[PDB]
Ligand binder design. Sequence first.
Ligand SMILES: NC[C@@H]1O[C@H](O[C@H]2[C@@H](O)[C@H](O[C@@H]3[C@@H](O)[C@H](N)C[C@H](N)[C@H]3O[C@H]3O[C@H](CO)[C@@H](O)[C@H](O)[C@H]3N)O[C@@H]2CO)[C@H](N)[C@@H](O)[C@@H]1O
Ligand SMILES: NC[C@@H]1O[C@H](O[C@H]2[C@@H](O)[C@H](O[C@@H]3[C@@H](O)[C@H](N)C[C@H](N)[C@H]3O[C@H]3O[C@H](CO)[C@@H](O)[C@H](O)[C@H]3N)O[C@@H]2CO)[C@H](N)[C@@H](O)[C@@H]1O
Ligand SMILES: [Mg+2]
Ligand SMILES: [Mg+2]
Ligand SMILES: [Mg+2]
Ligand SMILES: [Mg+2]
Ligand SMILES: [Mg+2]
Ligand SMILES: [Mg+2]
Ligand SMILES: [Mg+2]
Ligand SMILES: [Mg+2]
Ligand SMILES: [Mg+2]
Ligand SMILES: [Mg+2]
Ligand SMILES: [Mg+2]
Ligand SMILES: [Mg+2]
Ligand SMILES: [Mg+2]
Ligand SMILES: [Mg+2]
Ligand SMILES: [Mg+2]
Ligand SMILES: [Mg+2]
Ligand SMILES: [Mg+2]
Ligand SMILES: [Mg+2]
Ligand SMILES: [Mg+2]
Ligand SMILES: [Mg+2]
Ligand SMILES: [Mg+2]
Ligand SMILES: [Mg+2]
Ligand SMILES: [Mg+2]
Ligand SMILES: [Mg+2]
Ligand SMILES: [Mg+2]
Ligand SMILES: [Mg+2]
Ligand SMILES: [Mg+2]
Ligand SMILES: [Mg+2]
Lengths: 23, 296, 208, 171, 159
Amino acid sequence: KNTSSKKSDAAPASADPAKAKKK
Amino acid sequence: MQKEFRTSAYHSRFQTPFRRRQEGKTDYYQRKRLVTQHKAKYNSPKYRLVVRFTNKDIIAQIVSAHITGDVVFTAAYAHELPRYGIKYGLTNWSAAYAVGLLVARRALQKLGLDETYTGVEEVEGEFELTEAVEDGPRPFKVFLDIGLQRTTTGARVFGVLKGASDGGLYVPHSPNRFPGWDIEAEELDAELLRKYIFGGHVAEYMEELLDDDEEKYKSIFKNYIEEEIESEDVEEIYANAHEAIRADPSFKPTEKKFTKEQYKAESKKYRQQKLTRAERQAKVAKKIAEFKAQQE
Amino acid sequence: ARRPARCYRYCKNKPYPKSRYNRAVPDAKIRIYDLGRKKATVDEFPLCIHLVSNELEQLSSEALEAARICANKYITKVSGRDSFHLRVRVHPFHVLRINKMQGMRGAWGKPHGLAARVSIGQIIMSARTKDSNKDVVIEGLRRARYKFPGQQKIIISKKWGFTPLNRDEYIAKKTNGEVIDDGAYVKFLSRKGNLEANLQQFPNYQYS
Amino acid sequence: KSQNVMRELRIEKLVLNICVGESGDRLTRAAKVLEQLSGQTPVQSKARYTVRTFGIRRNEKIAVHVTVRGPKAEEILERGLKVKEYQLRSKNFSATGNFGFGIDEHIDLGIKYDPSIGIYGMDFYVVMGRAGARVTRRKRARSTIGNSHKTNKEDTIQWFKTRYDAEVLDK
Amino acid sequence: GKSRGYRSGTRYAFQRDFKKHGAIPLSTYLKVYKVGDIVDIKANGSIQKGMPHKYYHGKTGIVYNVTKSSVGVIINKVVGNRYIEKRVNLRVEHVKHSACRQEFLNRVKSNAAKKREAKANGETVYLKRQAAKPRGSRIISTEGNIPQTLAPVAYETFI
RNA sequence: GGUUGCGGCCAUAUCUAGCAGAAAGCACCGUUCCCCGUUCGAUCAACCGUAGUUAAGCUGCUAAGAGCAAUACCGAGUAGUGUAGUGGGAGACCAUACGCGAAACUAUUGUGCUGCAAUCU
RNA sequence: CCUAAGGGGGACUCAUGGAGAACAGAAAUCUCCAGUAGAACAAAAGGGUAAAAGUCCCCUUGAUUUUGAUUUUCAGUGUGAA
RNA sequence: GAGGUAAAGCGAAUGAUUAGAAGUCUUGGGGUUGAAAUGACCUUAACUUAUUCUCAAACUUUAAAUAUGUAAGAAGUCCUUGUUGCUUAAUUGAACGUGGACAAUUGAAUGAAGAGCUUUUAGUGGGCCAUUUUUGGUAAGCAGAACUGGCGAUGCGGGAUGA
Ligand SMILES: NC[C@@H]1O[C@H](O[C@H]2[C@@H](O)[C@H](O[C@@H]3[C@@H](O)[C@H](N)C[C@H](N)[C@H]3O[C@H]3O[C@H](CO)[C@@H](O)[C@H](O)[C@H]3N)O[C@@H]2CO)[C@H](N)[C@@H](O)[C@@H]1O
Ligand SMILES: NC[C@@H]1O[C@H](O[C@H]2[C@@H](O)[C@H](O[C@@H]3[C@@H](O)[C@H](N)C[C@H](N)[C@H]3O[C@H]3O[C@H](CO)[C@@H](O)[C@H](O)[C@H]3N)O[C@@H]2CO)[C@H](N)[C@@H](O)[C@@H]1O
Ligand SMILES: [Mg+2]
Ligand SMILES: [Mg+2]
Ligand SMILES: [Mg+2]
Ligand SMILES: [Mg+2]
Ligand SMILES: [Mg+2]
Ligand SMILES: [Mg+2]
Ligand SMILES: [Mg+2]
Ligand SMILES: [Mg+2]
Ligand SMILES: [Mg+2]
Ligand SMILES: [Mg+2]
Ligand SMILES: [Mg+2]
Ligand SMILES: [Mg+2]
Ligand SMILES: [Mg+2]
Ligand SMILES: [Mg+2]
Ligand SMILES: [Mg+2]
Ligand SMILES: [Mg+2]
Ligand SMILES: [Mg+2]
Ligand SMILES: [Mg+2]
Ligand SMILES: [Mg+2]
Ligand SMILES: [Mg+2]
Ligand SMILES: [Mg+2]
Ligand SMILES: [Mg+2]
Ligand SMILES: [Mg+2]
Ligand SMILES: [Mg+2]
Ligand SMILES: [Mg+2]
Ligand SMILES: [Mg+2]
Ligand SMILES: [Mg+2]
Ligand SMILES: [Mg+2]
């Protein structure tokens, strides 16, 4: 019905920083 | 452990925006677009209808911009309406229309355009623009400057718009942001606009609330109760005001209970005054000395 | 493999450091810049002796490493491993190029080594130690002078250790409570900023 | 004066989160439960980016959440505090004066159970605030709220204990 | 491969001043330019329409045309052994009045006022400017200022 | 002089932490039939000025505050540089001569000024 | 390479960090605070951009017609582009 | 007016980089385990804070010298009001004008075998050298750019001899 819209300009990425299992 | 953000380098490289943008008051994108004049119309200025709403007041000003600062041509406030017969609801949509008409008539009187360009003397709420008179000077052109206020169909700023247009000023506009515009059927219900001009929505609210929650009409519309003004006689309140506004739109300043100098001296009584360098030196020496008590 | 140093003695080219534009650069032979008792406090080693360049010239990382080892070895041999703190004051950041590793066509060279570009009067090596170890440290530096091309002077600093204060201004500022230890270095008192923080950091501050 | 009427702590909003890890009918059912509980159309959240491990892809609709304000927020909140027998943790309160907890079954809240719908756990977060927060949210003349008028962790914990007679443990 | 594009080599020339990026103060759009005005040209990197070519960045010229949002400026550009008149179309964001007019127009008014006042006084006044001349004779008092004798100082090392 | 609306220059105006603020203004603030917009009258829209408050916004003051601005028997006539020699030096480089002349550093001082209109204890 | 990644308007603010919320963990979704741009803008790099030029939404076809002037390369010829 | 090179800077952004010190609840591990509590201790390593050594053709707040644009009047400055289909709400402006006022110190220096203008045509279109700036190269009587001056095209005095 209604969905949150995107605010993050890094629309074209792949995964994410911060992610890296070691932490 | 996270990085401290507010470093000295952060403050050093920071670029403050314009003073009136950091206050959140001026949209300089829109302001630039409104003000810039065709450079081949060399010193002829563009005139803005600045319309601002406070919680209690409507401010309508006719402004031309210059390098040393903006210059007001005329200004009409909503608190001038009690002189014209409107004492309550100083923020109606209808109060906005009245303020626009008042500022329009006052500006045309200042200019000399009274008998020519009277406007819509018989207000029926139909969309209409002030057409120039053939073989004569063009009507005073002003562009609406609504500032940061959102543009919505039914907004009060366009009440000042319609009042100023009916007052004889040429203000370019379309009727699709007026109350009574059918978005599905792209036509203006001029009946509903005439309704909004003469307080019809508030009147319908008075009658509908008294007969549903009479106690709530007693709390919201007290002032109407103590003046013995019911819903059925609201339209005349504006209609009379309209005539009076057209009869004498001239500006009358408030008789001032004090002169500028007494006000200045009284206010000057307050306001803390800066400490002298010697004073702060004594202050720092005192704090330096008073830090001893924790040598441990 | 390595050409004679005479081929790269002079600052003929613009600085060519490792960057985003050349990446396949070898490492400098010098990696260690502080030797001896580098954790000693400022009062332990008041006497400072510098080896100063009297040449605008390039010194290889190879020469820097060799001179560093020579000086370190001699002083640890004569006075003990804990009698000094030696610091090399120039870092080789300039990449030398070699061409062959036809003719002059497409002759842009490949990284070959690293060199430090030194000026006239520039300090190359600094050695803080005690006064009784002066003649030792000077001779440690005199040998290291042999591993370098050009002229170097051994100059006894007027200042206390690695500080910017003379050996007299340091005592005045220390007995006045304006200097505190920070490990191997010190912090000096400031008459600007937060009054409470400045006072907290320097409790022994005899204010005027 | 610290005892002013306008310094009164009060709920600004409660945000309802169901982070179903997949897409399709189950997420639709979470939206239906949220629409039942709150009486409002919820909003579906799309993955901001793709994770193969979690079985999600960017812009695949994963979670659903809805924001409720006013008297209804208090009612849903007390229905959820009942499930917790009025016992939160110290950690559950943020440094900004907001707090939250998470139920595990949505029928404990007091709604009808449907086998087709199933049970979803649910996540609750409350944004606390005094009067005058519109200053930081209004369009014109936006500013910040002064430090004394801000909500902090301790004021919210004490306010919660007083208004609900609950205990906030700190294990 | 050689590169000689329109904005080649303008990395620093077309930059905004440090801590001076962003919106244009509106006095730029409120200034009035008339045919015959002398204007300096300095490109604004943030307005890409009507930008002058990098040659005219830092040049000064005369307005010959006035349009809706732009002015036309005549520049004399050296091409070989003569000058060629160049006519550049510029938006007013890249244009500023030359400050050399107002000093010279002020020297004209000042000359006129003094000349008419010497005429009023039946006297003469001399208006040609003169370069700075050698200073005249003078006498130096030594009360509080007896000369202090200096000598060159010996050599020292301060490291 | 304070305050509001519109501004010019765009930190001497910003940031952080405290404290104070008469009058008026501004503000928070109350309500949802109507125009309008939202998951949410929170924002936006409309109504009341009625029930409350200077708590916040805002304003002013405090701080050997950070930042910013200005000044200089500060550093320094230093670095650099235009010009000259059948100057020094194997060279690297350096001195001198006629001129121009920084940046960092240090110290001190300051912390918005102002245009149009309106209004106020 | 793009019917939008062109044009206009409007609304929103990006990278990232801290503190918090069932399964849920370093990374799923939610909230507040901070956040001068540390992101995003097809493609190299530079410049430019914050109530926008970035993100999202609405409407569109100015990516249309007639030919002149000008800027860059320049012979002040052509082409491309503006 | 413009500039971003020399210099300078890095307890200023970006990027690089040496050393300690003091602290923190994802300390990253070992060790002394106490029986397990992740709750202490010794330790190394991470981060954070205030410092410290050294750097940049494709880094930078600042920022020269030299070189560089314009102006320094009679075709100038001011006053008044004529024309228009352009412009202004206008009797507002824009441009071009009529008429009037300001006289040789007519608005800096120095110079000027005078200034301006036109047509037509030759040879040439291999260059090289010196100082300084400068790129590739270990370098070259090597290769390539910047400004000027030269040789070429030029004898004469000097450098013995030598573009
Ligand atoms: N430096 C050598 C030592 O000092 C003396 O040697 C002296 C000289 O032999 C030597 O001078 C040499 C000279 O020989 C040779 N023919 C020319 C060379 N440039 C000079 O070099 C000298 O001056 C230059 C500056 O011009 C300096 O840079 C260099 O360090 C210095 N050695 O340097 C000293 C004076 O400058 C002793 N006689 C000798 O035994 C001892 O080893
Ligand atoms: N500052 C004086 C300047 O004089 C200059 O020139 C002046 C004269 O040299 C020039 O010539 C004019 C001519 O235009 C006009 N139509 C006729 C007039 N006789 C001429 O002027 C001269 O010519 C005669 C005849 O030889 C001379 O004897 C006499 O010096 C002078 N009257 O015209 C001007 C006088 O009308 C500029 N043209 C003028 O604009 C400017 O004011
Ligand atoms: Mg707008
Ligand atoms: Mg050999
Ligand atoms: Mg374009
Ligand atoms: Mg685009
Ligand atoms: Mg578009
Ligand atoms: Mg927009
Ligand atoms: Mg950064
Ligand atoms: Mg980063
Ligand atoms: Mg033509
Ligand atoms: Mg052409
Ligand atoms: Mg072309
Ligand atoms: Mg091209
Ligand atoms: Mg085109
Ligand atoms: Mg450059
Ligand atoms: Mg540089
Ligand atoms: Mg440099
Ligand atoms: Mg610097
Ligand atoms: Mg740095
Ligand atoms: Mg610094
Ligand atoms: Mg760094
Ligand atoms: Mg020929
Ligand atoms: Mg030929
Ligand atoms: Mg040849
Ligand atoms: Mg030939
Ligand atoms: Mg020949
Ligand atoms: Mg000759
Ligand atoms: Mg001869
Ligand atoms: Mg000879």
